[PDB]
Amino acid sequence: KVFGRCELAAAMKRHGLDNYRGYSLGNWVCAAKFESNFNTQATNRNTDGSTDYGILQINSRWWCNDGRTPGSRNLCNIPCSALLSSDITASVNCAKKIVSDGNGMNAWVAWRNRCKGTDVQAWIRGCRL
Numbered sequence: 001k002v003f004g005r006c007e008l009a010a011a012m013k014r015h016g017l018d019n020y021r022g023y024s025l026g027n028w029v030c031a032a033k034f035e036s037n038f039n040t041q042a043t044n045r046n047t048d049g050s051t052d053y054g055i056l057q058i059n060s061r062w063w064c065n066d067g068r069t070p071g072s073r074n075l076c077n078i079p080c081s082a083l084l085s086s087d088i089t090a091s092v093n094c095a096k097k098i099v100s101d102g103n104g105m106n107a108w109v110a111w112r113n114r115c116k117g118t119d120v121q122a123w124i125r126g127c128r129l
């Protein structure tokens, strides 16, 4: 599923992501924009053989099981395929664990490089929320 911007903002809010660990909704929408272009089926293979999955490009090295990342963990206790669903529940639940892990949203390198410090409220501007 390719979400629209306000559609994703609304789904993130339903699922309790807004202001989660102090990150406003525009931070999450911005991170999703640059991680996946709002596509729940986005995947990206990393040099180390791990893979990033879904709207927030959650990585198999730590967070989900894909059976093809030696030595990895599955801290969200889900198959990485669950992260590609139309329904963003698994991605949100896992993102809450990631953002709680110590470095906040810096865990998402695209957020650090493209969202951090910018006018992230633009991402929710005009949305009926």
Ligand SMILES: [Cl-]
Pocket (backbone or CB within 6 Å): 024, 025, 026, 027, 120, 121, 122, 124
């Ligand atoms: Cl915001």
Ligand SMILES: [Cl-]
Pocket (backbone or CB within 6 Å): 049, 050, 051, 060, 066, 068, 069
């Ligand atoms: Cl992989």
Ligand SMILES: [Cl-]
Pocket (backbone or CB within 6 Å): 053, 054, 055, 056, 057, 058, 083, 091
């Ligand atoms: Cl994701």
Ligand SMILES: [Cl-]
Pocket (backbone or CB within 6 Å): 065, 066, 067
């Ligand atoms: Cl497996």
Ligand SMILES: [Cl-]
Pocket (backbone or CB within 6 Å): 065, 066, 067, 068, 069, 070, 071, 072
């Ligand atoms: Cl594995």
Ligand SMILES: [Cl-]
Pocket (backbone or CB within 6 Å): 065, 066, 078, 079, 080
């Ligand atoms: Cl599994």
Ligand SMILES: [Cl-]
Pocket (backbone or CB within 6 Å): 011, 086, 087, 088, 089
């Ligand atoms: Cl959803």
Ligand SMILES: [Cl-]
Pocket (backbone or CB within 6 Å): 021, 022, 103, 104, 105
């Ligand atoms: Cl933080």
Ligand SMILES: [Cl-]
Pocket (backbone or CB within 6 Å): 114
């Ligand atoms: Cl950018």
Ligand code: NA
Pocket (backbone or CB within 6 Å): 060, 061, 062, 063, 064, 065, 066, 067, 069, 072, 073, 074
């Ligand atoms: Na894994």
